[PDB]
Design a protein around this ligand. Structure first.
Ligand SMILES: *[C@@H]1O[C@H](CO)[C@@H](O)[C@H](O)[C@H]1NC(C)=O
Ligand SMILES: *[C@@H]1O[C@H](CO)[C@@H](O)[C@H](O)[C@H]1NC(C)=O
Ligand SMILES: *[C@@H]1O[C@H](CO)[C@@H](O)[C@H](O)[C@H]1NC(C)=O
Ligand SMILES: *[C@@H]1O[C@H](CO)[C@@H](O)[C@H](O)[C@H]1NC(C)=O
Ligand SMILES: [Cl-]
Ligand SMILES: [Zn+2]
Lengths: 48, 597
């Protein structure tokens, strides 16, 4: 009676409010630490 | 360790489960009411007993928490509202007897039929004919026949059923520590444990008696004027000092005097405000009406409606292929879903009704953040009052002129405003004595102050005393004429309308004072006033987690009902009516009756 299953459901339907709308979220995390950097953006130049 | 935290956890789980269950039930209701089929009815039954079983299970689970050991007021009110067990504490046999009585008498009211004495196979139901028979026809004999036939057909059947119902309700009240069922219904306005805001059960009776005493001069002046007009209309039926007949009041029971405006118009040559011509000329539709209401509501600062409401709600009659019941009703399905259902026509009355319905929506969305147990008004009387105040504000000719529905060349004068005040009084002033009378009679039969064998005699005696209505045909105790009304015949309270009449005009006075408007109150408008909007929201937000007196003070600064706004509103009509009534008798004589010659 005081012990419950700690999982709920996200009832989603296409007739819901914007505040309750199922937004899609992805978080991007970086690290500014002294280590060999393998990933960063490109750049290009002009002509010879 | 403590009990209040256990109750808090139980309420936390209850809110989460009940949200989904009530959403399912209300969505089923919305789909049934919009599309009338049989499988929709079946889904309604399934959801209905599912929700009722959840309610009874949760009550039988949470009854074991004693209310004496909780200090937080919100959870206290939650557990008090949940712990009311209703008919369950009574024996199961009597509970089934009570529900069978309710079903039988509801069916009697809904399917009651009366046949004319000349054609046995030609019979008329109350809804789609009896009302019209006496709300459109001016013949005395037809109205008398309809009234007598309806009462003789319903009251004779419903008398013993109502006696058993009242007895069962008295046992029900004594079961849960109330003296009478009238006390159970008065329990709506009770609050305890809040200093400076408490209210007792007899305080409501005392206050309503005082308010009626303060208001009765207006009713008696209007009664004298209407009696004089009916004298000019029907010269050989009523004494100029006697009471008005029951079947000459406009509707089934004399509840409203709206019908008699045509017969009692002071100046029938002045034009009446009707924007239906402007409705059809500008090719307005339902969507434009609701956009107009939306902009009127956004003008004071309230938010516009959600997209789901404009996407999924049915804003028009669904053709002829599918049938729907479209009485004006605002639905709170929960989970941030709001809906409206009403067959919209291009009329001014539908404009005001749409404004009322979206005022209902606004009130309902105001407390959407409150818990499941507390998502309701401070009491029952705030919803419809807030709905009606918006229609009252929109009915002002100034707003219609601003929104371009009336030409600016329209000349407002004393005569048109007097006619407007008189029709408003006929709609409003007429119903207050009848609601007070009916609810007081219900109180006094529930408390047992009246033996069975003189219910009707005392009913009619006090009616001819206060409400000034005398029966044209003498009746015995075999009748149950109170059960001829929808409210009496289906277990609803009726002081709600009097409380709403007080609340709506008190709110109008407060908001008009906040709106910095000069002149008569009927011309007052609240648009373009964000101060009025924020003042409205300051009471809109709470819901009922706090005492209704505090919510009332939040908008008006007063802790109790008062009658000053109504008399201040009708003072021009007061002086006009007292000027007219100088040559007519004021008051009514209880002895005279149409059947006594
Ligand atoms: C009402 O229900 C019937 C039965 O399924 C359906 O055919 C009809 O389209 C419905 N009406 C609507 C959705 O307006
Ligand atoms: C009552 O309970 C609510 C819900 O947890 C909480 O927010 C509020 O602070 C409590 N009030 C008191 C006075 O403990
Ligand atoms: C809703 O109201 C806001 C604020 O007044 C306004 O900016 C917005 O355009 C409105 N949306 C609609 C659809 O009317
Ligand atoms: C409300 O303000 C708007 C914006 O200036 C104006 O167009 C409208 O006429 C005003 N209405 C009233 C009733 O003051
Ligand atoms: Cl009646
Ligand atoms: Zn309403």
């Amino acid at each position: 009676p005081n012990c419950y299953f700690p999982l709920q459901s996200y009832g989603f339907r296409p007739t819901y409010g914007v505040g309750h709308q199922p937004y899609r979220v992805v978080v991007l995390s970086f690290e500014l630490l002294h280590a060999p950097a393998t990933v960063c953006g490109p750049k290009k130049s002009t002509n010879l | 360790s403590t009990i209040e935290e256990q109750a808090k956890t139980f309420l936390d789980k209850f809110n989460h489960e009940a949200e989904d269950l009530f959403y399912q039930s209300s969505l089923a209701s919305w789909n049934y009411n919009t599309n009338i089929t049989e499988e929709n009815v079946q889904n309604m039954n399934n959801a209905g007993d599912k929700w009722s079983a959840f309610l009874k299970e949760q009550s039988t689970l949470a009854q074991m928490y004693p209310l004496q050991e909780i200090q937080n007021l919100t959870v206290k009110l939650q557990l008090q509202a949940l712990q009311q067990n209703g008919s369950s504490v009574l024996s199961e046999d009597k509970s089934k007897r009570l529900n069978t009585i309710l079903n039988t008498m509801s069916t009697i009211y809904s399917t009651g039929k009366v046949c004319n004495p000349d054609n046995p196979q030609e019979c008329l139901l109350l809804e789609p004919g009896l009302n019209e028979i006496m709300a459109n026809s001016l013949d005395y004999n037809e109205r008398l026949w309809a009234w007598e036939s309806w009462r003789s057909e319903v009251g004779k059947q419903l008398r013993p059923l109502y006696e058993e119902y009242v007895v069962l309700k008295n046992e029900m009240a004594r079961a849960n520590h109330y003296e009478d069922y009238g006390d159970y219904w008065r329990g709506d306005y009770e609050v305890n444990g809040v200093d400076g805001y408490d209210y007792s059960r007899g305080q409501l009776i005392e206050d309503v008696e005082h308010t009626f005493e303060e208001i009765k001069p207006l009713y008696e002046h209007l009664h004298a004027y209407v009696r004089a007009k009916l004298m000019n209309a029907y010269p050989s039926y009523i004494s100029p000092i006697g009471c008005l007949p029951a079947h000459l009041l406009g509707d089934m029971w004399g509840r409203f005097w709206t019908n008699l405006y045509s017969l009692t118009v002071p100046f029938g040559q002045k034009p009446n405000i009707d924007v239906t011509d402007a409705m059809v000329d500008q090719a307005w539709d339902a969507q434009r009406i609701f956009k107009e209401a939306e902009k009127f509501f956004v003008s004071v600062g309230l938010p516009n409606m959600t997209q789901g409401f404009w996407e999924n709600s049915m804003l028009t009659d669904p053709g002829n292929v599918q049938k729907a019941v479209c009485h004006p009703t605002a639905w709170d399905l929960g989970k941030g879903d709001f809906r409206i259902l009403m067959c919209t026509k291009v009329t001014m009355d539908d404009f005001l009704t749409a404004h009322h319905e979206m005022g209902h929506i606004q009130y309902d969305m105001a407390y959407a953040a409150q818990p499941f147990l507390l998502r309701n008004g401070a009491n029952e009387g705030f919803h419809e009052a807030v709905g009606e105040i918006m229609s009252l504000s929109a009915a002002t000719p100034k707003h219609l002129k601003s929104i371009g529905l009336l030409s600016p060349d329209f000349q407002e004068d004393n005569e048109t405003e007097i006619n407007f005040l008189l029709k408003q009084a006929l709609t409003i002033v007429g119903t207050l004595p009848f609601t007070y009378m009916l609810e007081k009679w219900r109180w006094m039969v529930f408390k047992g102050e009246i033996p069975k064998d003189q219910w009707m005699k005392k009913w009619w005696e006090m009616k001819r005393e206060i409400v000034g209505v005398v029966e044209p045909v003498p009746h015995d105790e075999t009748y149950c004429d109170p059960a001829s009304l929808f409210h009496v015949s289906n277990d609803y309270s009726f002081i709600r309308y009097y409380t709403r009449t007080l609340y709506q005009f008190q709110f109008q006075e407060a908001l008009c004072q906040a709106a910095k408007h000069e002149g008569p109150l009927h011309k007052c408008d609240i648009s373009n006033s964000t101060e009025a909007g924020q003042k409205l929201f300051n009471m809109l937000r709470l819901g009922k987690s706090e005492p209704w007196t505090l919510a009332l003070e939040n908008v008006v600064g007063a802790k109790n009902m008062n009658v000053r706004p109504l008399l201040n509103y009708f003072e021009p009509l007061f002086t006009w009516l007292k000027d007219q009534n100088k040559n007519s008798f004021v008051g009514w004589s209880t002895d005279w009756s149409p059947y006594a010659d």
